Design a protein around this ligand. Sequence first.
Ligand SMILES: *[C@@H]1O[C@H](CO)[C@@H](O)[C@H](O)[C@H]1NC(C)=O
Ligand SMILES: *[C@@H]1O[C@H](CO)[C@@H](O)[C@H](O)[C@H]1NC(C)=O
Lengths: 40, 49
Amino acid sequence: SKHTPINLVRDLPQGFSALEPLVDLPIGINITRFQTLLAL
Amino acid sequence: FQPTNGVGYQPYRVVVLSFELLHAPATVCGPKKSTNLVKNKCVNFNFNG
Ligand SMILES: *[C@@H]1O[C@H](CO)[C@@H](O)[C@H](O)[C@H]1NC(C)=O
Ligand SMILES: *[C@@H]1O[C@H](CO)[C@@H](O)[C@H](O)[C@H]1NC(C)=O
């Protein structure tokens, strides 16, 4: 993951930024589908 | 039963902690006890494996 302040909205920001590792859980399961969550 | 039951009749607590090795993650270590760190000398080092 990485966090960075940007200015563009409808388009992804211009520039380069590496992402650092944050979590390395050994879940030891296999995943074939995913979904996001939202707050209303 | 009695609080001073003899062997073979008194309650027997058992724990069956089981060692398992499968597709589940294998977080297995060894009997490595920490030792002092020396410097400025030719030594055999083992940092995290
Ligand atoms: C992924 O699916 C495979 C074979 O299709 C199955 O063997 C396995 O149970 C799944 N992997 C995990 C870590 O659950
Ligand atoms: C909260 O902000 C956004 C605006 O669309 C949305 O979740 C909702 O319409 C707003 N009002 C709520 C959650 O009560």
